[PDB]
Amino acid sequence: RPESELIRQSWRVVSRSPLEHGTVLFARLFALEPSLLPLFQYNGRQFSSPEDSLSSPEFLDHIRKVMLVIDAAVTNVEDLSSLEEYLTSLGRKHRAVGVRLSSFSTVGESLLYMLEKSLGPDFTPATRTAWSRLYGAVVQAMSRGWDG
Ligand code: HEM
């Protein structure tokens, strides 16, 4: 797939600094949806503000995990059924911590945001469509983790 190459190429400069980029994604996420901030609790404590999440080793370690899973999707872009069961398993962990299916879109918007900003003029409408398609495939795989 030429479009798989668009994904792989677009991901290259992100993957070399996954924490800085994932930090953009999550900063965006809490700027769009501050109500997601309490879902991330460590020591039991609640982040008061979005910048508090950024000073937390556990939360930064969470970011790198997410960025690893997106990397795994990229690695497997040309089939993706090779990750299906992992992603479904990831989905039921999300159900169990109380995330809604409806939150998926804001995380995807946060990811696309982060890519557009990183790539600038290199984030062609073809690149964007390819990412939306990839993120959608990952979300449908995860959604089964609700039953599906
Ligand atoms: C529906 C929007 C989402 C919300 C609100 C959400 C929220 C969360 C929360 C609250 C956790 C647990 C945090 C913790 O206790 O440390 C988590 C874990 C995780 N998330 Fe998400 N998430 C969403 C979508 C996604 C997507 C699309 C991906 C990747 C494609 C993803 C990747 C991960 C990974 C890899 C973990 C670690 C799971 C584990 O430790 O077993 N999340 N997410």
Closest residue by Cα to residue 23 from 118, 90, 104, 95: 118
Ligand 1 atom closest to residue 111's alpha carbon, by position in its atom list: 27
Resolution limit, Å: 2.0
Q: CA–CA separation, 99 vs 97, rounded Å? A: 6
Rounded distance between C-alpha atoms, residue 119 and residue 15, angstroms:
12
**Ligand 1 atom nearest residue 87's Cα:** 30
DSSP string spanning 118-133?
Answer: HHGGGS-HHHHHHHHH
DSSP 49: S
What's the CA gap between 80 and 77, in Å, rounded?
6
Tokens of 74: 């990229």
Residue 40 beta carbon below 6 angstroms from any ligand 1 atom: yes
The method of structure determination was X-ray
Q: List the structure tokens of 89.
A: 């398993």
Query: How many Cα atoms occupy the beta-carbon half-sphere of 75 within 13 Å?
Result: 9
Domain span holding position 138: 1-148
117 lines ligand 1 (CB under 6 A): no
Which string of b and e fits 101-138 if b means at least 16 CB within 10 Å?
A: eeebeebbbbbbbbbeebbeeebeeebbebbeebbebb
Any binding-site annotation on 21? no
Quote the ligand 1 centre to 94 CA distance (angstroms).
6
Residue 74: which residues within 8 A CB-CB, separation 6 or more?
7, 8, 11, 15, 134
Strand-pairing partners, residue 42, are 45
Kindly give the number of the ligand 1 atom that is closest to the alpha carbon of 62.
16
C-alpha angle with apex 108: 105 to 109, nearest 5 degrees?
Answer: 85
The total domain count for the chain is 1
